[PDB]
Amino acid sequence: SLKEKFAEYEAFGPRILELWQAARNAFEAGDLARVANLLAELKELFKKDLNLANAMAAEAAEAGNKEAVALLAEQLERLKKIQAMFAAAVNAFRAGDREAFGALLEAIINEGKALLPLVEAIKEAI
Structure with a gap:
């Protein structure tokens, strides 16, 4: 169900943010084995997050919720942008490009942080 999906999507955002900030902490403390572990978890979480976002968008479209289709489209643009930086952040970690990895983090x-307040919008739209 669409509201059940959104209940799941809503919890993903703050967990993902937590992991990113933990990745920065681990990187800044030089704990590269932990950075890699966080990146792996983020790879799985981010995959599920973007799958849920896409599923909710298609469902809102079915139901003719034009308001929810638009808010979900904005979330997918932000997530696409995040996916691209993520790919580049992984590449920098593997090359040991510390300044690129930090600037990308x-x-x-x-x-x-900018996704989170948009997420409240989708709540009332569904």
Whole structure:
């Protein structure tokens, strides 16, 4: 159900943000084995998050909820942008490009913080 999906999507956002900030902490403390573990978890979580977002968008479309289709489209743009920085952040971690990885962590986390207040919008729209 659409509201049940949204209940699940709503919890993903703050967990994902937590993991990113933990990844920065682990990186700044030089704990690369932990950074890699966080990245793996984030890879699974982010996959599920984006799958849920896509499923909710198609469901809202079925129901003719034009208001929810638009809010969900904005969330998918932000998530696509995050996915691209994520790919680049992974590449930088593997090359050991510390400045690129740090600069990409800041910008991913600033995108993560900006998703959260938009998410409340989708709640009332469904």
